[PDB]
Structures are given as structure tokens and as C-alpha cells.
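2024-03-11 09:14:02 INFO receiving multi-entity request
2024-03-11 09:14:02 INFO entity count = eight
2024-03-11 09:14:03 INFO echoing inputs for audit
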Amino acid sequence: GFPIPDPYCWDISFRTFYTIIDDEHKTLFNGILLLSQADNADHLNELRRCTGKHFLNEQQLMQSSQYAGYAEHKKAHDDFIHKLDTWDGDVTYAKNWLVNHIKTIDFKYRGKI
Amino acid sequence: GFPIPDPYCWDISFRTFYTIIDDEHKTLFNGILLLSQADNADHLNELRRCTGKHFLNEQQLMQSSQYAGYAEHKKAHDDFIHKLDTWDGDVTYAKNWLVNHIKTIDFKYRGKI
Amino acid sequence: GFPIPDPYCWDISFRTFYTIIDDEHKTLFNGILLLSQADNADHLNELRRCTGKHFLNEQQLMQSSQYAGYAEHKKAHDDFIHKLDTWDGDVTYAKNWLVNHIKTIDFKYRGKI
Amino acid sequence: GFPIPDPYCWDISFRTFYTIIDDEHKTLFNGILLLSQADNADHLNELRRCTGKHFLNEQQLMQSSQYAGYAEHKKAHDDFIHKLDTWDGDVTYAKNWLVNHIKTIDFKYRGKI
Amino acid sequence: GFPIPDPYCWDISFRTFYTIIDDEHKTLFNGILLLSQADNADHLNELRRCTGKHFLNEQQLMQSSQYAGYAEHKKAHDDFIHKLDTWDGDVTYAKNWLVNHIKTIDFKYRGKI
Amino acid sequence: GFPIPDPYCWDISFRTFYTIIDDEHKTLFNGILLLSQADNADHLNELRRCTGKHFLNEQQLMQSSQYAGYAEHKKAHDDFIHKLDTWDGDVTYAKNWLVNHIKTIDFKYRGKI
Amino acid sequence: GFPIPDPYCWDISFRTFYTIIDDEHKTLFNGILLLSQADNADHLNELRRCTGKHFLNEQQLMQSSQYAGYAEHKKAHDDFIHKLDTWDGDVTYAKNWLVNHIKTIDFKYRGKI
Amino acid sequence: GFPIPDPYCWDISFRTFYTIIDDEHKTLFNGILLLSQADNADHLNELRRCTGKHFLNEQQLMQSSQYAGYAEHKKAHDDFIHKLDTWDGDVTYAKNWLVNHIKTIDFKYRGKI
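2024-03-11 09:21:47 INFO inference complete, emitting structure
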């Protein structure tokens, strides 16, 4: 159970040490930040695009080293895409989801991929 | 229901703002233009090649961001390839199909991929 | 003196047999056609972007086989960019320039790159 | 004089329509925000890495179409690196620099690369 | 029914005008030539490697433009790999197979891929 | 039945003459060496990552030339990943497995891929 | 003095153990063989294209490991291009040049790149 | 003065957190170890190849973020190549050189590239 940064932006406590990964993460934080300012279609498209792109790249990176925790990781990802495809305006959920996902699921692959 | 450019060439009203996409689109317009001048095998091969190439690239681009409207988009594409594989000389259909596809189906992915 | 297509569009007489080159050429015909319809900034940008890109790609293809005619060919490309960058609205010049360039300068690399 | 976002995060007013460019820009906003929270070595490293990378990638994109404004644009980038490399802690300068750069220097390549 | 070159080497009558394709073809001719000089394991490995590599690349090239005659083309390829995997020393067959395959099946994709 | 190098490091008797392959092999030897010094999680992650990466690359290389002994080779690989995913501390097995795998299974693809 | 193959085709005595290099070499043997059958423009183009390409690729491979013999090796390649570019029809020279080059200059990079 | 591993193999104390860099480093330890077992041509070739390659790759990684320490770092690499190219058999020097280089010069780019 991790703190929710305020303002909702990436900080170095989220570093995975995979610079590509971290840079993509920065875009998810920003995506959620925009929704938190105006829940509209431009903002959701922006978050949705970045999310889909990051999840697939990250998935690719896991596959490249035949990561053993892939399947569970991909299912987490897919659930979240799914929430975005049926967006309900629950910004709070999203803020929480990302913090947790990174600090628990992503942090797990460090050193194995 | 959009106007059919005359001569049948790409114009900036078709811009998707994905330069690779737009450049490929220019080749589909030209492909249909040739058929409209001489319905022969050279012209149809030319259009067919460009169409198959563009549809797959565009499909790839959609997949890279796990675009939610992929499946419907790919089925549209496949139907059209199919018409080209059973070419009937209906140039009018083709002129119409492309204008519409771009301005309705392709324009839909803008900002999401 | 090669004939100037009317409408000013690519035809199979311009084929180089390098599909990537041919698809790019189609974009240069389109760029000149748009300027002939309306000599504005959007149209010139489009043509200028496609030209710079095509010239560099073709240059790279020449370099990959250490093509003996590279220097002279690069100089010809560069002279045309210069014309685009100091654009005077002479569409006639451009229409002629492109037809001639493909049919006499580009046609000379066929089989050598 | 463009408005300085507060919190200092990317918004869609900064859109260039080049998704890769936009995602990188988001990382530069984040880098400046972290320094505004704490002017330390980690934060500066992060910003410096993202900046060097973005500047080189954008430069490459400009080169790929032989963009006529390249030289002047590269010089502007280089002047900012210099500022990062001789960092004096002037966060205000940086916040202004980035907003201005995107909205007047980067916006000028749109449609040309 | 085409002539069998003697010596068994590639000639320009086999040009497909896809330089990558032609260069790979040259290696298949050489592969069969070696077997024709000494039917041993080194020579067959050499032909087998080149064959497998060429067939997959060529297949990839067909897929890139969603070539309509792919399936029939791939099945031809697979039959031949199969003969190589159960090599019987029938060099005559191999000499014949390749000449025919190129001049009938490969020549068919020209202009469509 | 091959000797187990002591110290457990790669030597030129293991050369496959595929430099990429050999360089990756060097990392598997090192991975097993670390486990042999301290059976901990850091060391096993390190070996596991390198193993998964090498097996997939090698598999890719085999596929590129449609290697006939792929299926048997991939099943060997997968069994070993499997032992790593259920690590028992049997370092002896691992030392043996690798020496053998390289000198018997990997040496088999030489000249065919 | 290495023996000149007759027919003038690549054999496994020319193996470098770099499959990409070996496949390219096969194209250079073929190019010289065609010229020995008919000293014309098509044949010379073919050889000249394959040579320029091979020389640049091999050069790149040398550079990737910072090969200490690069300069001298590049100079040898360049001298041969020069001969192709000022072609006098001396097929004998070419047959000798290539055999010697591979067996004494290329063989020296083996194990170093 | 960092401790010299014995046996002379990579350990996790050398981690840079760049997996590609770490895997390459492992090859440099191995190269020096082989020379300590037998100071011959094969061993030196191996080390020299791996070194040239690693130095260039790491250099490229530094350039991709316009790393401010590049020049000085390149000079250090080049001085070592020089030592390998004028090899005197001083294994002691090499063992020390590598440990020191990683732990003080490479460690300085962490977080910046």
C-alpha cells in the first residue's frame, strides 16, 4: 500500500532502472493527471494510447528473456486496458492501480529481464 | 458521404497526420487512378500490392498501441482486398470505398495510435 | 523531352522496379499536382517533406552498393531542394524537372543498386 | 509569452501530432517538475538523460526529411544542454525555456518532417 | 520447360528484379552445383541452410504485401525442403526443380510484392 | 561425456563459430559459476535471465534457416528452463547439462544455420 | 598461388564461417563467371553491384569490433572497385584477384570480428 | 583499489543495471581469464574482438543520450585497445585495468544514459 504522489506525477521512487520502461511510465502518470483535470475524450485517448503501447513493449521485454511471471503480468495489464475501454470516470481507481502495479508487479521483473 | 476528388488524387483534406500513413494513402489514390485510365493487369497489380502493403502496416500501427477498434478495422480491410482479388472492373465502387474508408474508419484511430 | 502526364500523376512508364522508390515517386507527383491546384504553404510543405525524404532514401540505396554515380546524383537532388526552398511558384519547371529526373537520372541506377 | 502550466506537466496544448515526440516531451516536463521539488543530482541526471535523448531523436527526425530549419533548431537544443551541463539551479529559466521551445521552435517543424 | 544451364550457375535470364531475391537465388544454384560435384554432408548442409533461409525471406516478402498466391507458393517451398530433409542423391531432380520454380512460381510474384 | 572446466568458465573448445552465440554462452558459464559460489536469488535471476534470452535468440537463429532439428532442440531448452524455474540447488547437474548441451546439441547446428 | 576454380564457382575451401559473408562471396564468383561467358554491361553491372554491397557490408562487420586491419582491408577493396569502374575486360585478373583476396585478406579477420 | 576477483570472473558487484552492458562485461572477464590460462593468439583474438565490440556498443549507448562524459570515456577505451594491439603479455595490468574501469569509469554513466 503505497502513497499517491500529489501532484500525480512520476518520481524516482518508481524507478525500475530500465530507462525505456521508466520513460513510458512517466507518460501513464501524465495520462492519469489529465483525466484528473478534465475527464474528456482527448485525455482518455492519450492515456489509452500510452497504456496500450507501454503494456505491449513491457510484455515484449518480458518475453525476450522468457520471464516466468509473464502470464500473470499480462493478465493484470489486460484487466486495466479493459477498464479503460469501459471508462467510468473513476480517476481514483486509476491513480491507485498504477502506483500499485509498478511498485508490486513491475518491480518484480527487475533483474530478471 | 464525401466528395470524390476529380482528378482522383490525394488532397490534404485526407491527412491523418501520420506521415507514413498519408504517404501510403497517396499510392492507393494513384492505384485507383490508373485503373480508371486502363483496366489492365499492370494497373491492378500495382493497386493490389500497395493495398496489401498499406493495410498490413496500418494494422501493425494499430496493434502497437493495442487499438480497441482493430478487429472492425481489419475486417473492412480484408473485404476490400477480397474485391481486388475478384476484380470486376467496378472502378466507381473503388473510388467511393477509399474516400469513405479514410474519412470514416482511418480518421477514427487518430490520436489513439 | 518526355511527355508531361496530364493529369500530373505517376504512371507505370515511370517504373524503376524498386517498389519503395516507385511508391515514393508517386508522392512527388502528388505534391506537384497539389501545388498546381493551389500554390500555398500546406502544399509546398507536403511536397518539400516528401522530396527531402525521397532524396535521402534514394541516396542511401545508392550508397549501399557504393554506386559510382552517387555524387552527381546527389548534386542534382540538392539543386532541386534549393529550388523548393526558394520557391517562386514555377510549377511548370517542377513538372518538367521531375519527369526528366526520373526518366534520365534515376533510370541510370537500375540494375546497379 | 505562453502560460506556464501549474502543476508543471504536459497538457494537450503542447501536442505536435508526432506521438513519439509528444511522449518524449512529457518526460522533459517531468524532469523539470522533479527539480522544482528538489534540486539534486538524481533529478538533474534524469532530466539531462531525457533531454539529450529527446534532442537527438528529434534531430534525427528532422534529418530524415532534410528539414530546412535543422541547423537553427540544433543550435537551440545545444544551448539548452549547455545550461543543463552548467546547472545553476534556475528552475524558472528551465520552465520557461521548455514551454517556449515547444510552442515556437518545435511547432514550426509540424507538417515538414 | 526451361533449359538447364551448364555449368549450373545463375544467369541473368533468372532475374526477378528483386536484388535480394536474385542474390539469394545465386546461392541455391551454387548449392546444387556443389552436390553435383561431391554428394556429401558439407555440400548438402550448405544447400539446405541457403534454401531454408531463402524460402523464409521470400515468404516474408510475399506476406508484406499480402500476396494472393502465397499459400500455393509456400506449399511448393515446403515440398522441396522435405526432399532435402530426405536427400536421395537425385541431383537431376534438384537442377530441374529450381530452374522451374524460379521461372514459373517466383516469376509470378513480380510486380505484386 | 566431456570434461567439466575448472574453474567453470567458457573456453575456446566450446566455440560454435557464431560469435553472438559464443558470447551468450560465456554468460551461462558465469551464471552457473555464481550459483556455485553462493546459491542465492541474485545469482539465480542472473542465470535465469541469461538462459531465457540465449535460448530464445538461438531458437530464432535456427528458425531463420528453417533448421530441421529445431523441435528437439527447443524441447531440450524448455526442460532446462523448467529446472531453473524449480531450482533445487543441484549445481552439479547444471554444470554437466551445459557442457553437454553445447558440445552435443548446439554443435549439431553448426554449418546449417 | 591458390588454384582457380573451374568452373569459376565458390567451393567450401573458401569458407570464412560467417554465413552472411560466405553467401555474399558466392555472388562475387557468379558475377566473374558471367563476365567470362559474356563481357557485357548487364554482367558488369551485376558484379559491380554485388561487389560494392559486399565490400561495404564486410567493412561494417570489421568496424563493429573495431578490427585492427580495417584500413588496409578497405584500401584493397577500394582498389578493386576502381578496377571494376575502369573495366578493361581482363577477366583473368578478376578471377585471380578474388581467390587471393578471400584466401589471404578476408581469412585474416576470422575470429576477430 | 578494488579487489581482483579470483577466479577472474564477473560478479554482481560489477553490476551496472544495463543488462546488455553487464552481459558484455562478462565476456571481457572471460577473455582476460583465458589469457591468464594461456597467453596465445586465439585467446587474445577473443578478448580483442569482445573488447572492440563492447567499447563501441557502450560508446553508442553514451551517444544516444548525448552523455557529457563521452569524450573522456572514449579516450580511456581507446588507450586500452592500444594496449591490446601492442600486447606484451602483462595479464596483471589487464586484470587491474578492467576492474578499475568498470567500477570507476563505467559506474559514472549510471542513471545518465
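2024-03-11 09:21:48 INFO post-check: Chains F and C do not touch (no CB pair under 8 Å).
2024-03-11 09:21:48 INFO post-check: The radius of gyration of chain F is 13 Å.
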